[PDB]
Amino acid sequence: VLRGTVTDFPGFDGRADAETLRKAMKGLGTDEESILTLLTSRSNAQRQEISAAFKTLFGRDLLDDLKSELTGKFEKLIVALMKPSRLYDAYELKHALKGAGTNEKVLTEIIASRTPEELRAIKQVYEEEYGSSLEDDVVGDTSGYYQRMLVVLLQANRDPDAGIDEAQVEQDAQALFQAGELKWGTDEEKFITIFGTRSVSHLRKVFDKYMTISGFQIEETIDRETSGNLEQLLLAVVKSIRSIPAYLAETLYYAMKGAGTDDHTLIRVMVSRSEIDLFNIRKEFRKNFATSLYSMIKGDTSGDYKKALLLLC
Ligand SMILES: [Ca+2]
Ligand SMILES: [Ca+2]
Ligand SMILES: [Ca+2]
Ligand SMILES: [Ca+2]
């Protein structure tokens, strides 16, 4: 069952909260600790009510005020909290597509881990907000089978979980076996349909059967955690069919491991999942990585940015 770490604050008063925030901002400087503790303990819907209340009481726009007063990764994190939950994934998608080049990592990550229902809603908001079709901007920025696989997934049309046709489980585990042995370089079209179109429970049975045929897990054969956009996507889909919290816990782990931090991914997964499954991601993190998410964040981040992330966690 999915559990998030941010819920609605009981006893919420949008007006009183807008006043605290005004007082924190107003005058020389800023009180970041006041902003930080309030906005991490109100849900996203309550933050939208605070923005509305701030504007009725003061005629000032709350988010421009926050962008004025805050700086750096803390500012980026607060701005991300303030994005309406329904617009945020579409916002991240638009910013990976836009401009020169493209950030394929955010593309793989959101399209492979969002459910068909989330994707239909995202496609809708993206159009409404940006005028173009998510699909046309994706096609405009990606090439090859990576492009094809993304479009397949963007159709939000996986089969229903019902007819476990074990003959087609058999059949599909064979195709993937043969494809794995050829390093996913030969019959792309066959396996893009299997990974994009089958039901989640069919593909779980297919992944079990693959292992019984080969002796190893299917991600062993696709395991190049770098280099090759299609392979990175195949890996994100296999991982998300098994468990979307486990896959998102893993991208968090790799955002902090080594020199530096991928603060954009750390902010994106912490914020986008705070009210969906961040608790499940936490449990998966500890289980698969033998460290709690809190402790890795704490050693990897500093200042008010750290304080706010630890309160979200
Ligand atoms: Ca000020
Ligand atoms: Ca200050
Ligand atoms: Ca681009
Ligand atoms: Ca690091």
Coordinates of all heavy atoms in Angstrom, one line a residue, residues 87-176:
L87 N 1.4 19.5 -11.6 CA 2.2 20.2 -12.6 C 3.6 19.8 -12.6 O 4.2 19.8 -13.6 CB 2.1 21.7 -12.6 CG 0.8 22.5 -12.4 CD1 1.1 23.9 -12.6 CD2 -0.2 22.1 -13.4
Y88 N 4.1 19.3 -11.4 CA 5.5 19.1 -11.2 C 6.2 18.1 -12.2 O 7.2 18.4 -12.7 CB 5.8 18.7 -9.8 CG 7.3 18.7 -9.4 CD1 8.0 19.9 -9.5 CD2 7.9 17.5 -9.1 CE1 9.3 19.9 -9.1 CE2 9.2 17.5 -8.7 CZ 9.9 18.7 -8.8 OH 11.3 18.8 -8.5
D89 N 5.7 16.9 -12.4 CA 6.3 16.0 -13.3 C 6.4 16.5 -14.8 O 7.4 16.4 -15.4 CB 5.6 14.7 -13.3 CG 6.0 13.8 -12.1 OD1 6.9 14.1 -11.4 OD2 5.3 12.7 -12.0
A90 N 5.3 17.2 -15.2 CA 5.2 17.8 -16.5 C 6.3 18.9 -16.6 O 6.9 19.2 -17.6 CB 3.9 18.4 -16.7
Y91 N 6.5 19.7 -15.5 CA 7.4 20.7 -15.4 C 8.9 20.2 -15.6 O 9.7 20.7 -16.3 CB 7.2 21.4 -14.0 CG 8.3 22.4 -13.6 CD1 8.2 23.7 -14.1 CD2 9.3 22.0 -12.8 CE1 9.2 24.6 -13.7 CE2 10.3 22.9 -12.5 CZ 10.2 24.2 -12.9 OH 11.2 25.1 -12.6
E92 N 9.2 19.1 -14.8 CA 10.5 18.4 -15.0 C 10.7 17.9 -16.4 O 11.8 18.0 -17.0 CB 10.5 17.3 -14.0 CG 10.9 17.8 -12.6 CD 12.3 18.3 -12.5 OE1 13.2 17.6 -13.0 OE2 12.5 19.4 -12.0
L93 N 9.7 17.3 -17.0 CA 9.7 16.8 -18.4 C 10.0 17.9 -19.4 O 11.0 17.8 -20.1 CB 8.4 16.1 -18.7 CG 8.3 14.6 -18.8 CD1 9.6 13.9 -18.4 CD2 7.2 14.1 -17.9
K94 N 9.3 19.0 -19.4 CA 9.5 20.2 -20.2 C 11.0 20.7 -20.0 O 11.7 21.0 -21.0 CB 8.6 21.3 -19.8 CG 8.7 22.6 -20.6 CD 8.4 22.3 -22.0 CE 8.6 23.5 -23.0 NZ 8.5 23.1 -24.4
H95 N 11.5 20.8 -18.8 CA 12.9 21.3 -18.6 C 14.0 20.3 -19.0 O 15.1 20.7 -19.2 CB 13.1 21.7 -17.2 CG 12.3 23.0 -16.9 ND1 11.0 23.2 -17.1 CD2 12.9 24.2 -16.5 CE1 10.8 24.5 -16.8 NE2 11.9 25.0 -16.4
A96 N 13.7 19.0 -19.2 CA 14.7 18.1 -19.7 C 14.7 18.1 -21.3 O 15.6 17.7 -22.0 CB 14.4 16.6 -19.3
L97 N 13.6 18.5 -21.8 CA 13.4 18.6 -23.3 C 13.9 19.8 -24.0 O 14.7 19.8 -24.9 CB 11.9 18.3 -23.6 CG 11.6 16.9 -23.4 CD1 10.1 16.7 -23.5 CD2 12.3 16.0 -24.4
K98 N 13.4 20.9 -23.4 CA 13.7 22.3 -23.8 C 15.2 22.5 -24.0 O 16.1 21.7 -23.6 CB 13.2 23.2 -22.7 CG 12.8 24.5 -23.2 CD 12.4 25.5 -22.1 CE 12.2 26.9 -22.8 NZ 11.8 27.9 -21.9
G99 N 15.5 23.5 -24.8 CA 16.9 23.9 -25.2 C 17.7 22.8 -25.9 O 17.2 21.7 -26.3
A100 N 19.0 23.2 -26.0 CA 20.1 22.4 -26.7 C 20.3 21.2 -25.9 O 20.3 21.2 -24.7 CB 21.4 23.2 -26.7
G101 N 20.5 20.1 -26.7 CA 20.7 18.8 -26.1 C 19.3 18.3 -25.5 O 18.2 18.8 -25.9
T102 N 19.4 17.4 -24.5 CA 18.2 17.0 -23.8 C 18.7 16.2 -22.5 O 19.8 15.6 -22.5 CB 17.4 16.1 -24.7 OG1 16.3 17.1 -25.0 CG2 16.8 14.8 -24.2
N103 N 18.0 16.3 -21.4 CA 18.4 15.5 -20.3 C 17.6 14.2 -20.3 O 16.5 14.1 -19.8 CB 18.2 16.3 -19.0 CG 18.7 15.6 -17.8 OD1 18.5 16.1 -16.7 ND2 19.4 14.4 -17.8
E104 N 18.2 13.2 -20.9 CA 17.6 11.9 -21.1 C 17.3 11.2 -19.7 O 16.3 10.5 -19.6 CB 18.4 10.9 -22.0 CG 18.6 11.4 -23.4 CD 19.9 12.2 -23.7 OE1 20.7 12.5 -22.8 OE2 20.1 12.5 -24.9
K105 N 18.2 11.4 -18.8 CA 18.0 10.8 -17.4 C 16.6 11.1 -16.8 O 16.0 10.2 -16.3 CB 19.1 11.4 -16.5 CG 18.9 10.8 -15.1 CD 19.8 11.3 -14.0 CE 19.2 10.6 -12.9 NZ 20.0 10.8 -11.7
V106 N 16.2 12.4 -16.8 CA 14.9 12.7 -16.2 C 13.8 12.1 -17.1 O 12.8 11.5 -16.6 CB 14.7 14.3 -16.2 CG1 13.4 14.7 -15.6 CG2 15.8 14.9 -15.4
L107 N 13.9 12.0 -18.4 CA 13.0 11.4 -19.3 C 12.8 9.9 -19.0 O 11.6 9.5 -18.8 CB 13.5 11.5 -20.8 CG 12.9 12.5 -21.7 CD1 12.7 13.8 -21.1 CD2 13.9 12.7 -22.9
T108 N 13.8 9.1 -18.9 CA 13.8 7.7 -18.6 C 13.2 7.5 -17.2 O 12.2 6.7 -17.0 CB 15.3 7.2 -18.6 OG1 15.7 7.3 -19.9 CG2 15.4 5.8 -18.0
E109 N 13.6 8.4 -16.2 CA 13.2 8.2 -14.9 C 11.7 8.4 -14.7 O 11.0 7.6 -14.2 CB 14.0 9.2 -14.0 CG 13.8 9.0 -12.5 CD 14.3 10.2 -11.8 OE1 15.5 10.4 -11.7 OE2 13.5 10.9 -11.2
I110 N 11.1 9.5 -15.2 CA 9.6 9.7 -15.0 C 8.8 8.8 -15.9 O 7.9 8.2 -15.5 CB 9.4 11.2 -15.3 CG1 10.0 12.1 -14.2 CG2 7.8 11.5 -15.4 CD1 9.9 13.6 -14.4
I111 N 9.2 8.6 -17.2 CA 8.3 7.8 -18.1 C 8.4 6.3 -17.7 O 7.4 5.6 -17.8 CB 8.8 8.1 -19.5 CG1 8.4 9.5 -19.9 CG2 8.1 7.1 -20.5 CD1 8.9 10.0 -21.3
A112 N 9.5 5.8 -17.2 CA 9.6 4.4 -16.7 C 8.9 4.2 -15.4 O 8.4 3.1 -15.2 CB 11.0 3.9 -16.7
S113 N 8.9 5.2 -14.4 CA 8.4 4.9 -13.1 C 7.0 5.4 -12.9 O 6.4 5.2 -11.8 CB 9.3 5.5 -12.0 OG 9.4 6.9 -12.2
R114 N 6.3 6.1 -13.8 CA 5.0 6.6 -13.5 C 4.0 5.5 -14.1 O 4.3 4.9 -15.1 CB 4.8 8.0 -14.2 CG 5.1 9.2 -13.3 CD 6.4 9.0 -12.5 NE 6.7 10.1 -11.7 CZ 7.8 10.3 -11.0 NH1 8.8 9.4 -11.0 NH2 8.0 11.4 -10.4
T115 N 2.9 5.3 -13.4 CA 1.9 4.4 -13.9 C 1.2 4.9 -15.1 O 1.2 6.2 -15.3 CB 0.9 4.1 -12.7 OG1 0.2 5.4 -12.5 CG2 1.6 3.7 -11.4
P116 N 0.4 4.1 -15.9 CA -0.3 4.6 -17.0 C -1.3 5.7 -16.7 O -1.4 6.7 -17.4 CB -1.0 3.3 -17.5 CG 0.0 2.3 -17.2 CD 0.5 2.7 -15.8
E117 N -1.9 5.6 -15.5 CA -2.8 6.7 -15.0 C -2.1 8.0 -14.8 O -2.6 9.0 -15.1 CB -3.5 6.2 -13.7 CG -4.7 7.0 -13.4 CD -4.8 7.4 -11.9 OE1 -4.4 6.7 -11.0 OE2 -5.3 8.6 -11.7
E118 N -0.9 8.0 -14.2 CA -0.1 9.2 -14.0 C 0.3 9.8 -15.3 O 0.2 11.0 -15.4 CB 1.2 8.9 -13.2 CG 0.8 8.5 -11.8 CD 1.9 8.1 -10.9 OE1 2.7 7.2 -11.2 OE2 2.0 8.7 -9.8
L119 N 0.7 9.0 -16.2 CA 1.2 9.4 -17.5 C 0.0 10.0 -18.3 O 0.3 11.1 -19.0 CB 1.7 8.2 -18.3 CG 3.1 7.7 -17.9 CD1 3.4 6.4 -18.7 CD2 4.2 8.7 -18.0
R120 N -1.2 9.5 -18.3 CA -2.3 10.2 -19.0 C -2.6 11.5 -18.4 O -2.8 12.5 -19.2 CB -3.6 9.4 -18.8 CG -3.5 8.0 -19.5 CD -4.7 7.2 -19.1 NE -4.5 5.9 -19.5 CZ -4.6 4.9 -18.7 NH1 -5.0 5.0 -17.4 NH2 -4.4 3.6 -19.2
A121 N -2.5 11.7 -17.1 CA -2.7 13.0 -16.5 C -1.5 13.9 -16.8 O -1.8 15.1 -17.2 CB -2.8 12.7 -15.0
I122 N -0.3 13.4 -16.8 CA 0.9 14.3 -17.1 C 0.7 14.7 -18.6 O 0.9 15.9 -18.8 CB 2.2 13.4 -17.0 CG1 2.5 13.4 -15.5 CG2 3.4 14.1 -17.7 CD1 3.5 12.2 -15.1
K123 N 0.4 13.9 -19.5 CA 0.3 14.3 -20.9 C -0.7 15.4 -21.1 O -0.5 16.3 -21.9 CB -0.1 13.1 -21.8 CG 1.0 12.1 -21.9 CD 0.7 11.0 -23.0 CE -0.5 10.2 -22.6 NZ -0.9 9.4 -23.7
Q124 N -1.8 15.3 -20.3 CA -2.8 16.3 -20.4 C -2.4 17.6 -19.8 O -2.5 18.7 -20.5 CB -4.0 15.7 -19.6 CG -5.3 16.4 -19.9 CD -6.4 15.8 -19.1 OE1 -7.0 16.4 -18.2 NE2 -6.7 14.5 -19.4
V125 N -1.8 17.7 -18.6 CA -1.3 18.9 -18.0 C -0.2 19.6 -18.9 O -0.2 20.8 -19.1 CB -0.8 18.6 -16.6 CG1 -0.2 19.9 -16.0 CG2 -1.9 18.2 -15.7
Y126 N 0.7 18.8 -19.4 CA 1.8 19.3 -20.2 C 1.3 20.1 -21.4 O 1.8 21.2 -21.7 CB 2.6 18.1 -20.7 CG 3.9 18.4 -21.4 CD1 5.1 18.4 -20.6 CD2 4.0 18.7 -22.7 CE1 6.3 18.7 -21.2 CE2 5.2 19.0 -23.3 CZ 6.3 19.0 -22.6 OH 7.6 19.3 -23.1
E127 N 0.3 19.6 -22.1 CA -0.3 20.2 -23.3 C -0.9 21.5 -22.9 O -0.6 22.6 -23.4 CB -1.4 19.3 -23.8 CG -1.0 18.6 -25.1 CD -1.8 18.9 -26.3 OE1 -3.0 19.1 -26.2 OE2 -1.2 19.1 -27.4
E128 N -1.7 21.5 -21.9 CA -2.4 22.6 -21.3 C -1.5 23.7 -20.9 O -1.7 24.9 -21.2 CB -3.2 22.0 -20.2 CG -4.3 22.6 -19.4 CD -4.9 21.6 -18.4 OE1 -5.7 20.7 -18.8 OE2 -4.5 21.6 -17.3
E129 N -0.4 23.3 -20.2 CA 0.6 24.3 -19.7 C 1.5 24.8 -20.8 O 1.9 26.0 -20.7 CB 1.3 23.6 -18.6 CG 1.5 24.4 -17.3 CD 0.2 24.9 -16.8 OE1 -0.8 24.0 -16.6 OE2 0.1 26.0 -16.5
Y130 N 1.9 23.9 -21.7 CA 3.0 24.3 -22.6 C 2.6 24.4 -24.0 O 3.4 24.7 -24.9 CB 4.2 23.3 -22.5 CG 4.7 23.3 -21.0 CD1 4.6 22.1 -20.3 CD2 5.1 24.4 -20.4 CE1 5.0 22.0 -19.0 CE2 5.5 24.4 -19.1 CZ 5.5 23.2 -18.4 OH 5.8 23.2 -17.1
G131 N 1.3 24.1 -24.4 CA 0.8 24.2 -25.7 C 1.1 23.0 -26.6 O 0.4 22.7 -27.5
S132 N 2.3 22.3 -26.4 CA 2.6 21.2 -27.2 C 2.3 19.9 -26.5 O 2.2 19.8 -25.2 CB 4.0 21.3 -27.7 OG 4.3 20.3 -28.7
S133 N 2.3 18.9 -27.3 CA 2.1 17.5 -27.0 C 3.4 17.0 -26.4 O 4.5 17.1 -27.0 CB 1.7 16.9 -28.3 OG 1.6 15.5 -28.5
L134 N 3.4 16.2 -25.3 CA 4.6 15.7 -24.7 C 5.3 14.8 -25.7 O 6.5 14.9 -26.0 CB 4.2 14.9 -23.4 CG 5.3 14.1 -22.7 CD1 6.6 14.8 -22.4 CD2 4.6 13.7 -21.3
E135 N 4.5 13.9 -26.3 CA 4.9 13.0 -27.4 C 5.6 13.7 -28.5 O 6.7 13.3 -29.0 CB 3.7 12.3 -27.9 CG 4.1 11.1 -28.7 CD 2.9 10.5 -29.3 OE1 2.0 10.1 -28.6 OE2 2.9 10.4 -30.5
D136 N 5.2 14.9 -29.0 CA 5.8 15.5 -30.1 C 7.2 16.1 -29.7 O 8.1 16.1 -30.4 CB 4.9 16.6 -30.7 CG 3.8 16.0 -31.5 OD1 3.9 14.9 -32.0 OD2 2.8 16.7 -31.6
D137 N 7.2 16.7 -28.4 CA 8.5 17.2 -28.0 C 9.5 16.1 -27.7 O 10.7 16.3 -28.0 CB 8.2 18.0 -26.7 CG 7.5 19.3 -26.9 OD1 7.4 19.8 -28.1 OD2 7.0 19.9 -26.0
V138 N 9.0 14.9 -27.2 CA 9.9 13.7 -27.0 C 10.4 13.3 -28.4 O 11.6 13.2 -28.6 CB 9.1 12.6 -26.4 CG1 9.7 11.2 -26.5 CG2 9.0 12.9 -24.9
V139 N 9.6 13.1 -29.4 CA 10.0 12.8 -30.7 C 10.9 13.8 -31.3 O 11.9 13.5 -32.0 CB 8.7 12.6 -31.5 CG1 8.9 12.6 -33.0 CG2 8.1 11.3 -31.2
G140 N 10.7 15.1 -31.0 CA 11.6 16.1 -31.4 C 13.0 16.0 -30.8 O 14.0 16.5 -31.3
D141 N 13.1 15.4 -29.6 CA 14.4 15.4 -28.9 C 15.1 14.0 -28.8 O 16.2 14.0 -28.4 CB 14.2 16.0 -27.5 CG 14.2 17.5 -27.6 OD1 13.2 18.2 -27.8 OD2 15.2 18.1 -27.3
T142 N 14.4 12.9 -29.1 CA 15.1 11.6 -29.0 C 15.2 11.0 -30.3 O 14.5 11.4 -31.3 CB 14.3 10.8 -27.9 OG1 12.9 10.7 -28.4 CG2 14.4 11.4 -26.5
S143 N 16.0 10.0 -30.5 CA 16.2 9.3 -31.8 C 16.2 7.8 -31.5 O 16.2 7.4 -30.3 CB 17.5 9.8 -32.3 OG 17.6 9.6 -33.7
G144 N 16.1 7.0 -32.5 CA 16.3 5.6 -32.5 C 15.2 4.8 -31.7 O 14.1 5.3 -31.4
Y145 N 15.6 3.6 -31.3 CA 14.7 2.8 -30.5 C 14.5 3.4 -29.1 O 13.4 3.1 -28.6 CB 15.2 1.4 -30.4 CG 15.1 0.7 -31.7 CD1 16.3 0.4 -32.4 CD2 13.9 0.4 -32.3 CE1 16.3 -0.2 -33.6 CE2 13.9 -0.2 -33.5 CZ 15.1 -0.6 -34.2 OH 15.1 -1.2 -35.4
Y146 N 15.4 4.2 -28.6 CA 15.1 4.9 -27.4 C 13.9 5.7 -27.5 O 13.0 5.7 -26.6 CB 16.3 5.8 -27.0 CG 16.1 6.6 -25.7 CD1 15.8 6.0 -24.5 CD2 16.2 8.0 -25.7 CE1 15.6 6.7 -23.3 CE2 15.9 8.8 -24.6 CZ 15.7 8.1 -23.4 OH 15.4 8.8 -22.2
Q147 N 13.8 6.4 -28.7 CA 12.6 7.3 -29.0 C 11.3 6.4 -29.1 O 10.3 6.7 -28.5 CB 12.8 8.0 -30.3 CG 11.6 8.9 -30.6 CD 11.5 9.3 -32.1 OE1 10.8 8.6 -32.8 NE2 12.2 10.3 -32.6
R148 N 11.4 5.3 -29.8 CA 10.3 4.4 -30.0 C 9.8 3.9 -28.7 O 8.6 3.9 -28.4 CB 10.7 3.2 -30.9 CG 10.5 3.4 -32.4 CD 11.4 4.4 -33.0 NE 11.4 4.4 -34.4 CZ 12.2 3.8 -35.2 NH1 13.2 3.0 -34.7 NH2 12.1 3.9 -36.5
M149 N 10.7 3.4 -27.8 CA 10.3 2.8 -26.5 C 9.6 3.8 -25.6 O 8.7 3.5 -25.0 CB 11.6 2.3 -25.9 CG 11.4 1.7 -24.5 SD 11.3 0.0 -24.2 CE 9.6 -0.1 -23.9
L150 N 10.1 5.1 -25.7 CA 9.5 6.2 -24.9 C 8.1 6.4 -25.4 O 7.2 6.7 -24.6 CB 10.4 7.4 -25.1 CG 11.0 8.1 -23.9 CD1 11.6 7.1 -22.9 CD2 12.2 9.0 -24.4
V151 N 7.8 6.4 -26.7 CA 6.5 6.7 -27.3 C 5.6 5.6 -26.9 O 4.5 5.9 -26.5 CB 6.7 6.8 -28.8 CG1 5.3 7.1 -29.5 CG2 7.6 8.0 -29.2
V152 N 6.0 4.3 -27.0 CA 5.2 3.1 -26.6 C 4.8 3.3 -25.2 O 3.6 3.3 -24.9 CB 6.1 1.8 -26.7 CG1 5.4 0.6 -26.1 CG2 6.4 1.4 -28.1
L153 N 5.7 3.6 -24.3 CA 5.4 3.9 -22.9 C 4.5 5.1 -22.7 O 3.6 5.0 -21.9 CB 6.7 4.1 -22.1 CG 7.6 2.9 -21.8 CD1 8.9 3.4 -21.1 CD2 6.9 1.9 -21.0
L154 N 4.7 6.1 -23.5 CA 3.8 7.3 -23.5 C 2.4 7.0 -23.9 O 1.5 7.8 -23.7 CB 4.5 8.3 -24.3 CG 4.8 9.7 -23.7 CD1 4.9 9.7 -22.2 CD2 6.0 10.3 -24.3
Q155 N 2.1 5.9 -24.6 CA 0.8 5.6 -24.9 C -0.1 5.2 -23.7 O -1.3 5.1 -23.9 CB 0.7 4.5 -26.0 CG 1.4 4.9 -27.3 CD 1.1 6.3 -27.8 OE1 0.0 6.7 -28.0 NE2 2.1 7.2 -27.8
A156 N 0.5 4.9 -22.6 CA -0.2 4.6 -21.3 C -1.2 3.4 -21.5 O -2.3 3.4 -21.0 CB -0.8 5.8 -20.8
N157 N -0.8 2.5 -22.3 CA -1.6 1.4 -22.7 C -1.1 0.0 -22.4 O -0.9 -0.9 -23.3 CB -1.8 1.5 -24.2 CG -3.2 1.8 -24.7 OD1 -4.2 1.1 -24.6 ND2 -3.4 3.1 -25.2
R158 N -0.7 -0.3 -21.1 CA -0.2 -1.7 -20.9 C -1.5 -2.6 -20.7 O -2.6 -2.1 -20.4 CB 0.5 -1.8 -19.5 CG 1.5 -0.7 -19.2 CD 2.5 -1.1 -18.1 NE 3.2 -2.2 -18.6 CZ 4.5 -2.2 -19.1 NH1 5.2 -1.1 -19.1 NH2 4.9 -3.3 -19.6
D159 N -1.3 -3.9 -21.0 CA -2.4 -4.8 -20.8 C -2.9 -4.8 -19.4 O -2.1 -4.5 -18.5 CB -2.0 -6.2 -21.2 CG -1.8 -6.5 -22.7 OD1 -2.1 -5.7 -23.5 OD2 -1.2 -7.5 -22.9
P160 N -4.2 -5.2 -19.1 CA -4.7 -5.4 -17.8 C -4.0 -6.6 -17.1 O -3.6 -7.6 -17.7 CB -6.2 -5.5 -18.0 CG -6.3 -6.2 -19.3 CD -5.2 -5.4 -20.1
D161 N -4.0 -6.6 -15.7 CA -3.5 -7.7 -15.0 C -4.7 -8.7 -14.9 O -5.6 -8.5 -14.2 CB -3.1 -7.2 -13.6 CG -1.9 -6.3 -13.7 OD1 -0.8 -6.7 -14.0 OD2 -2.1 -5.1 -13.4
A162 N -4.6 -9.8 -15.7 CA -5.7 -10.8 -15.7 C -5.2 -12.0 -16.4 O -4.7 -12.9 -15.8 CB -6.9 -10.2 -16.5
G163 N -5.4 -12.2 -17.7 CA -5.0 -13.5 -18.4 C -3.6 -13.8 -18.4 O -2.8 -13.4 -19.4
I164 N -3.1 -14.5 -17.4 CA -1.8 -15.0 -17.4 C -1.7 -16.3 -18.3 O -2.1 -17.4 -18.0 CB -1.4 -15.2 -15.9 CG1 0.1 -15.5 -15.9 CG2 -2.2 -16.3 -15.2 CD1 0.7 -14.7 -14.8
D165 N -1.4 -15.9 -19.6 CA -1.3 -16.9 -20.6 C 0.1 -17.4 -20.5 O 1.1 -16.9 -21.1 CB -1.6 -16.2 -22.0 CG -1.5 -17.0 -23.2 OD1 -1.1 -18.2 -23.2 OD2 -1.9 -16.5 -24.3
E166 N 0.3 -18.5 -19.7 CA 1.6 -19.1 -19.5 C 2.3 -19.5 -20.7 O 3.6 -19.6 -20.8 CB 1.5 -20.3 -18.5 CG 2.8 -20.7 -17.9 CD 2.6 -21.8 -16.8 OE1 2.3 -21.5 -15.7 OE2 2.7 -23.0 -17.2
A167 N 1.6 -19.8 -21.8 CA 2.3 -20.1 -23.1 C 2.9 -18.8 -23.6 O 4.0 -18.8 -24.2 CB 1.2 -20.6 -24.1
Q168 N 2.3 -17.6 -23.5 CA 2.9 -16.4 -23.9 C 3.9 -16.0 -22.8 O 4.8 -15.2 -23.2 CB 1.8 -15.3 -24.0 CG 2.3 -14.2 -24.9 CD 1.2 -13.3 -25.6 OE1 1.1 -13.2 -26.8 NE2 0.4 -12.7 -24.8
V169 N 3.8 -16.4 -21.6 CA 4.9 -16.1 -20.6 C 6.2 -16.9 -21.1 O 7.2 -16.3 -21.3 CB 4.5 -16.6 -19.2 CG1 5.7 -16.5 -18.2 CG2 3.4 -15.7 -18.6
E170 N 6.0 -18.1 -21.5 CA 7.0 -19.0 -22.1 C 7.7 -18.5 -23.3 O 8.9 -18.4 -23.3 CB 6.4 -20.3 -22.4 CG 6.3 -21.3 -21.3 CD 7.5 -22.2 -21.2 OE1 8.7 -21.8 -21.3 OE2 7.2 -23.4 -20.9
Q171 N 6.8 -18.1 -24.2 CA 7.2 -17.5 -25.4 C 8.0 -16.2 -25.3 O 9.1 -16.0 -25.9 CB 5.9 -17.2 -26.2 CG 6.1 -17.2 -27.7 CD 4.9 -16.6 -28.5 OE1 5.0 -15.9 -29.5 NE2 3.6 -16.8 -28.1
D172 N 7.5 -15.3 -24.4 CA 8.2 -14.1 -24.2 C 9.5 -14.2 -23.4 O 10.4 -13.5 -23.7 CB 7.3 -13.1 -23.4 CG 6.0 -12.6 -24.2 OD1 5.9 -12.7 -25.4 OD2 5.2 -12.0 -23.5
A173 N 9.6 -15.2 -22.5 CA 10.8 -15.4 -21.8 C 11.9 -15.8 -22.8 O 13.0 -15.4 -22.7 CB 10.7 -16.4 -20.7
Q174 N 11.5 -16.6 -23.8 CA 12.4 -17.1 -24.8 C 12.9 -15.9 -25.6 O 14.1 -15.8 -25.8 CB 11.7 -18.1 -25.7 CG 12.2 -19.5 -25.3 CD 13.7 -19.7 -25.4 OE1 14.3 -19.4 -26.4 NE2 14.3 -20.3 -24.4
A175 N 12.0 -15.1 -26.2 CA 12.4 -13.9 -26.9 C 13.4 -13.1 -26.1 O 14.6 -12.8 -26.6 CB 11.2 -13.0 -27.3
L176 N 13.1 -12.7 -24.9 CA 14.0 -11.9 -24.1 C 15.4 -12.6 -23.8 O 16.4 -11.9 -23.7 CB 13.4 -11.6 -22.7 CG 12.6 -10.2 -22.5 CD1 12.2 -9.6 -23.9 CD2 11.5 -10.5 -21.6

